[PDB]
C-alpha cells in the first residue's frame, strides 16, 4: 500500500510485465493469464495478477514517460518484492532497415532525460538491461520463429520534440527504436537492485507508407507478449 | 482525433482543468459540471465537457510527469482550440509554515527536467504562468474566503529522488510545493502559444507525513476546484 | 558601512528604486524625491534618500550586469534593512509588436548567467518577482493611464552576444525585453530574504534601431518612475 | 596507410583483438596465433595478423585511455574494413562480491568523458557492446569452465581521480570493473557502424588468467562465426 | 559614439588602462598623466586621455563584473581602435604564501561565468593574456625593484558566493588572486582580435590580521600603475 | 616503482622532456643526452636519464591523449620528485598565417575534455603553462634564430571529431595549434604543484624541425636554471 498502489505484499508476482497503457494491461491479463485478479486501480493504473502456464505473473500499466514508470517500478521493487520487470510497448523507428512490426529488444537505452545524471554525479551512466533477461527473450523469440533485433533504444522526454534534429543523430548512432521510458526503468533497476528489460514492437517509422493492417499489427504485438511471458519461464529454469 | 485523444474539434471547451489523475477528472465532471459528457478514454485518460454556471468547460487528466502532460496539453492546444489550461493537482510541502490541505498557486516553477533547456538553448527559461490567470485565481480565492500562497513550485522528474539534500535547497529558496508537471505545462504553453496556470493542494509533507485516497476527492481538493472554476469566470469578464 | 556602500543603518528607506545608471538615480532624486539627500558615492554609485508624497524612499544605481547589481542589492538587504527593490531600467525589444518607450514588467526573468544554477544545484530556478509587487505595478499603471506588458525578461551577460540565433529563441518564447540584471536581482532577493521587481523601458530594438541620452531622462522613462513610485504607495496600503 | 597504421587494406583480419599494452600484442601473436606476420609498427604499437584454428585474426594494442583507443578503433574500421573489435584488458573492482581475477564482460560502459556527449548532442548515449559478441564471450567462457560476470564497466578519464566519492556511486549502481576505454570504443563502433566488446580480468580491488581471457576472446569469435 | 561612450575615434589612445572604479580612473589621470582630458562621462564611467612620458595613454573605469567590463572593452576595440587593454585592479588571495600588497599578473584567468562557454561551443576556452604584454609587465616591475607573481586569477560572478567551498578549490589549483573581470576581458580580446592584460594588487586575504597601513597599501597600488604605464613603453620598443 | 613506471626516487631528473611517441625518447637520449641510462620499460614506454651540458635530464614518452599523459605526469611528480615537465610534440593548424614547421608554444590550452571541470567543480579552469618556462623557451628559440609563436593550443579528445564546425571556432579565437594533451598536463601540474610547458611544431594544416624543438626545449631548461 503506497500512494500509487492499493495492494499488499504478495498481491504481485515477483515478475511484472508492464505496458504503458493501463487498458493494455487488462488486455494482456484477459488474453494470456488464467485466474487473473485486479490488484490495483489507483488513478486508473490497472494492475493484474494471474498465472501463465502455472507460473504466477503480474501485469500493470506504467503510464507514459520516465517520471511515471519510475514511480511504479520503484514501488514494485521496494514495496512488493518484485525482482524482474519487463516493459512491453511500442516504438518509432529511425533506421531504414528497421521495418514496421519488427520486435526490438533494448539491451541499452539512450535518453535526453536528466534522471540518470542526477543519479550518477552528472556523468554518463549506461542504462542497460539485465543480460540474462535479454538472452531469455532472444531465445524465446527464436522458439517462436520470431527473430528480434537487440540494440539501443532512445527514451525521449518530449514525444513532440521542439527540433527533430535529434532523429538524424539517433539514426547515425544506430538506435533501433524510439520510446519514452526504458532509460528510466533501467535507472530504477540499477538504483534499487532489481532486473529490468524492455521489448518493443515498431509501430511507426519516419518515412511512412500505406498503413499496414491492424490484424498483422496486433499479431506481432501478441508475439511480443508471448516472447515476454515465455522468456521468464526460461529464466525460472 | 490526435495520437492520444479520440475527439474532434469542438468537443473540448477553450478552457480545460487538468488534474494528473483520470479519476479525479471524472470526480470533477460528476461533482461540478452540469450535463457532463465524456469525450475521451484512449489510454484511460478520461476527458469530460460540461458547463459550470452556463460556462462551457472541460476537465481531463494529464498523467504523472512532464513527458505525459506535455503530450496532452500539446494535442489540446494544437488540435482542439484550447486557449487556457489550469492544472489542479497535488504536491509535497518542504517549508515548515506550510500545512496539509493548503492551496498553492504557482506563478513560477523550478524544475530538474532538461525539457526547457532543450527549448531554450541550454539557458535558463523562467517557466512562468499567465499573469492574469494568477490574479484571477487569487481573486477567486479571496471571494471564496480560501487562503492561497502565490509563488514557485518545483517540478520534479523523480518522485523518489536520490538527492534529498535538494529539498534543503528548495526550502532555502522558498519553493511552495513539490509536484511533477507545472514547469512542463508552462513550457508547452509558451512553445505552442496558449496560457496556463497550476494550482495545487498540499497532499503531503516531504519532511513529515502524507495522506491517501482523499487526493481523488476532498473538500480542500474541492477548494482548489472552486478557485479554478471561479477564476475562469473572472477571466471571461 | 559595507564594502561598496559608505552608509549607516537607517540612511536608506525600506524600499529602494534602482536604475543601472548612477546619473539616472541622481535625476530621479532631483525630479521626484522631496528633500533628497545623498547617502553614497563610493565608486560613483550615487545613492539618495528623500520622500515621495510623505513616503520615505531611496534611489541608487546598481551598475551594469548581474555581478554588479548582486553586490549592491545584497549589501542593501543584509546591512541596511531594505525590504523591497524595484529595478527601473532599460531594455532591448525582440518582438515585432513591441515599440520603443514601451513599459515592461518582468514577472519572470530568463538568463544565460550561471549564477542561479550555482545556487540551485545546477537545476532550473525560476527567477520570479514578488507577486504583490507586480500587481501593485500593474494597478499603478492603469491608474496613470500607461500601458505595460507583464511577462518574461531575459537577463544577458553579454550585451554584444556572439550568438544572434538566440534572439530568435527569445522571440519564439515571447520574452518582452533583453536587459542585464533582473534574473540576478531575483536570485539575490530569494537567497537573502527580500522582495523585488524589475520594470523596464524599451530603449532599443534588437532587430531595428536604438536611442541615446534620453535613457538618463525621458517622459517614458518618467512613466516607469511614476509607476514604480506609485506602486510602492499601493503596497503600503 | 593511415596516420597511425602503416598498412594497407587486407593486412588486418575483419576481427581485431586489442590489448592496452603494446608488448602484449606480440605475446598473443606468438602464443595463440598461427603463421603470424607483422603488419604495423608506427609508434611501437605493433600489430600482427595470423589465424586461430583457420580463422583469420589480428592483434594490436590501443594505448591507455579513450582518446588513444578511439584513434586506432576508428582507423581500423574505416580504412581496414575491420568489422569487430574485442578489447582484452584489466580493471579494478568496487563491489565486494567481485573478486580478483574474476572475468568481467562489459555489456555496457559508463564514463566521465565528454566524448559521447559531443557525439550525442549533449544527451545520454548508452555506450553498449554487440549482444551476440557478449553472448559468444559468455558461452566461450562457460565451455572453458570459467564464470564471467556481465554488466556495466566504468571508463575513467582520470586513473587518479581527484574525488574518490565517485567509487561509492559506481558500487551503488553495480558497475563490475573500472577501466579506461570501453565507452570510447563503443562510441566509435556506434559512430562508424561496427561491433565491439571489451573483456576484462579484475587485477585489483596473472598470466593464467590473462591466457584465459585471450582464449575466451578467440573462442568467442569462432562461436560468432556460427 | 556608442550607447556607453560619448567620444569619437581619436579620443582614446590605442592603449587603455582600466580600473574598475570610475573615480580611480580620474585618480590615475591626475596622478600620472599630463594634459589629461575627460573623453567620456556616460553613466558616470569617467574616461581620460593624456600622455605619460610623451606617450599618449587613456584611462577609464570598467565597472564591476565580466558583463560590465565586456561592454566597454568591446566598444574600445571595435569602435575606437584600441589595440591594448590593461586592467589595473585589486584581488583577494587564497594561497598562504601570497601576502597583502603582492602584485599579481594574470597570465590566465579561471571563471565561474558562462560567457566563454557560450563563445566556445560549450568547451573549455583558456582565457589568457597576451604574452608580450605579460613579459613587458614582468620586466617593468623588475626595473622598479618590484617582483611580481605570474599565474592564474579567478574571475567570480558572485563577490558574495553562496558557498565558499570554491575557495579551497582555488587554493588547491593555485590561483593567485580572486577578482571579477579578467576572464571576461580575455574573452573579448580573443573574440575581437586585440590584446589584454590584467594586473592586480592583493588587497585582502582569507585569514586576515591587523589591517596594514593605507600609506603602504596606496604605495603598492601606485607601483602597479607605474608597472602598467612603463610596460607599454617597453612594448613600443 | 609506480603502476606505470618501474623505477625509484632519484632515477628521474627534476626535469622531464616528454614526446608522445615512445620511439622518440630513445632517439633523444642517444642524440642529445650524455651518459644516458635506461630507467623505465613497463609498457614499452621507455625512459632515460642523462645530462645536457652537465644538467641532469630525463626523457620518456607519455602516449596519445589526456588520460595517458595524465597518468605519467602525475606519477613522475608525486613519486619521483619531478618539478618541471616539457612536452615536445606536433600539432595541426587552423590559422592561415601559421605555417607548417612553425614552432608553437602553448601559454594556455583549451580543450573539449571534462578532466579539468571534474577538478574545478564544473567551472572554467584556465589550463596554463608556467610563465618562466614559456619565456625560457621563447628566449632559447630566439638564440637559435627561430621564431616561436606563443598562444593557445587546443587539446582535442577526438583526433577524428564528429563536428568540423569547431575548427572554425578555434580559428576565430586564435588558437595556434591543435593537439591532444597540453590541457591535461597543465591540469596535473596545477593539481600537484609542479610546472609544465608544451612546445609543438606544426606538422599539418621534419627531423630538422624536430631536432630544433628538442634543442629549444633543452636550452630553455638551462636558461630556467639562471
Ligand atoms: O515514435 C514514437 N516516439 C516516442 N514514443 C513512442 C511510443 C511509445 O508510446 C507512448 C507514447 O505514444 C510512450 O509511452 C512510448 O513508449 N511508441 N511510438 C513512439
Ligand atoms: O511530494 C510530492 N513530490 C512530488 N510530486 C508530488 C505530487 C504530485 O502527485 C503526482 C505523483 O504522486 C504527480 O503528478 C505530482 O505532481 N504530490 N505530492 C508530491
Ligand atoms: O538591447 C539591450 N540588450 C541588453 N541590455 C540592454 C539594456 C540595459 O542597459 C544596460 C546596458 O546598456 C544594462 O544594464 C541592461 O539591463 N538596455 N538595452 C539593452
Ligand atoms: O584499477 C584500475 N583503474 C583504471 N584502469 C585500470 C586498468 C586498465 O589499465 C590501464 C591503466 O593502468 C588502462 O588502460 C585500463 O584499461 N586496470 N586496472 C585498472
Ligand atoms: O576578494 C575579492 N573577491 C572578488 N573581487 C575582488 C576585488 C575586485 O574589486 C571589485 C569588487 O570589490 C571587483 O571589480 C574585483 O575586481 N578585489 N578583491 C576582491
Ligand atoms: O593535426 C593534429 N590533430 C590532433 N593531434 C595532432 C598531433 C599530435 O599527434 C598525436 C596524435 O596523432 C597526438 O598525441 C597529438 O599531440 N599532431 N598533429 C595533430
Structure explained in plain terms:
Six copies of one chain form a homohexamer. Chain A is of the alpha/beta class. Chain A has a single domain (1-237), classed as Rossmann fold (3-Layer(aba) Sandwich), CATH 3.40.50.1580. In chain A, 35% of the residues lie in helices and 27% in strands. Chain A has seven helices and nine strands. Chain A has a nine-stranded mixed β-sheet, with helices on both faces. In chain A, helix 2 (66-80) runs parallel beside helix 6 and helix 4 packs across helix 7. Chain A is globular and about 45 Å long. In chain A, 63% of the residues are buried. The interface between E and F is large, with 35 and 36 residues. The structure holds formycin B (FMB) (6 copies). The PDB classes it as transferase. Keywords: protein-nucleoside complex, transferase. The assembly is hexameric. The entry is titled "Escherichia coli Purine Nucleoside Phosphorylase Complexed with Formycin B and Phosphate/Sulfate".
Amino acid at each position: 500500500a503506497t500512494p500509487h498502489i492499493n495492494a499488499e505484499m504478495g498481491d504481485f508476482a515477483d515478475v511484472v510485465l508492464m505496458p504503458g497503457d493501463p487498458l493494455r494491461a487488462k488486455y494482456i491479463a484477459e488474453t494470456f493469464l488464467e485466474d487473473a485478479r485486479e490488484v490495483n486501480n489507483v488513478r486508473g493504473m490497472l494492475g493484474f495478477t494471474g498465472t501463465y502456464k502455472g507460473r504466477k505473473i503480474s501485469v500493470m500499466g506504467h503510464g507514459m514517460g520516465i517520471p511515471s514508470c519510475s514511480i511504479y517500478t520503484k514501488e514494485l521493487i521496494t514495496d512488493f518484492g518484485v525482482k524482474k520487470i519487463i516493459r512491453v510497448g511500442s516504438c518509432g523507428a529511425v533506421l531504414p532497415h528497421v521495418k514496421l512490426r519488427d520486435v526490438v529488444i533494448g539491451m541499452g537505452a539512450c535518453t535526453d532525460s536528466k534522471v540518470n545524471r542526477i543519479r550518477f554525479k552528472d556523468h554518463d551512466f549506461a542504462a542497460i538491461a539485465d543480460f540474462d533477461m535479454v538472452r531469455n527473450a532472444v531465445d524465446a523469440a527464436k522458439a517462436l520463429g520470431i527473430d528480434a533485433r537487440v540494440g539501443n533504444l532512445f527514451s525521449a522526454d518530449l514525444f513532440y520534440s521542439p527540433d527533430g534534429e535529434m532523429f538524424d543523430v539517433m539514426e547515425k548512432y544506430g538506435i533501433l527504436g524510439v520510446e519514452m521510458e526504458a532509460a528510466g526503468i533501467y535507472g530504477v533497476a540499477a538504483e534499487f537492485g532489481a532486473k529490468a528489460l524492455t521489448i518493443c514492437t515498431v509501430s511507426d517509422h519516419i518515412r511512412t507508407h500505406e498503413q499496414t493492417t491492424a490484424a498483422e499489427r496486433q499479431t506481432t504485438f501478441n508475439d511480443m507478449i508471448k516472447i515476454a511471458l515465455e522468456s521468464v519461464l526460461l529464466g525460472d529454469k
